[model samples]
Target: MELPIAPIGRIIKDAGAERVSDDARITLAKILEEMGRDIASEAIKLARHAGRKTIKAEDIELAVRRFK
Candidate 1:
């Protein structure tokens, strides 16, 4: 999935950064995309374990903890 750079810049801005560079936004997007994919993959496993095809919020919560 392609992540939008504009929202990433907004995220940095909301985090108290007065100015953010384009490179910074791209870097963050890369990291977040990888993290997101990892977390989602774990969530998928959790869903499958429970015999559900749909990934739920509970699966995601547990997946994040496991990922950490």
Candidate 2:
């Protein structure tokens, strides 16, 4: 997935960082993409088990819960 670098920096700032670094933003983006991939993969399996080709919010919710 193509993640926006600027938005990632903004997210860090929202989390209480006064000034975020380029390395921090890039790292967050990488981690998020990796986690997203894992979640999406699990969500796909849930959708398939439910006999649906399309992945829905419920599938993603359940997949995240499983991760926790």
Candidate 3:
């Protein structure tokens, strides 16, 4: 199943805090591969722990600690 996340290969220009390298496409893809996976993994675990099948923003929050 695919969720409506930002495309893995597409990098937004200053849209979010991805800490990607300078104006490069392929490099950005590589960066996203690692960071995005980290987010998705925590999000999945948090969702399961919450006993919810559907992922929610709060669940993602549990995955991302930068907001704290």
Candidate 4:
């Protein structure tokens, strides 16, 4: 899970940050990567439970909906 540095900075800017720090961008990207990995893993489980090899959008949608 590779998060682009530019977008990470842009995300902070979009949230109204006048200046985004490198450390902040890196930290947020790390957290986002972990979250994305967890979500994808759970989505895979949903796909497998449906007896499918491909992970569809519905699987991700359902998995996200069930998340705490």
Each model's C-alpha lDDT? Answer: 0.95, 0.94, 0.67, 0.89
Q: Tell me, by TM-score, which candidate is best.
A: 2
Error of 3 at 4 (Å): 14
Q: Candidate 4: where is the Cα deviation over 4 Å? A: none
For candidate 1, which ten residues in a row score worst on lDDT? 59-68
User: For each candidate, what TM-score against the reference?
Assistant: 0.93, 0.95, 0.58, 0.91
**Which ranges of candidate 3 are over 4 A from the true structure?**
1-23, 66-68
Candidate 4, residues 1-68: lDDT per residue as tens digits?
48877788899899899998899999999998888888899999999999999999999888888777
Which residue pairs collide, candidate 3? none
Candidate 3 has an lDDT of: 0.67
In candidate 2, stretches whose alpha carbon ends up further than 4 angstroms from where it belongs are: none
CA deviation > 4 Å runs, candidate 1: none
Better of 1 and 2 by TM-score: 2
For candidate 2, the TM-score is 0.95
What order do you get sorting by TM-score, best first? 2, 1, 4, 3
Per-model clash counts, in order, read 0, 0, 0, 0
Please report how far candidate 3 places residue 16 from its true position, in Å. Answer: 14
Candidate 1: tens digits of C-alpha lDDT, residues 1-68: 48999999999999899899999999999999999999999999999999999999999999999966
**Clashing pairs for predicted structure model 1, backbone only:** none
Query: How far is each candidate from the true structure, as Cα RMSD in Å?
Result: 0.9, 0.9, 6.5, 1.1
The local lDDT score (0 to 100) that residue 48 gets in candidate 2 is 100
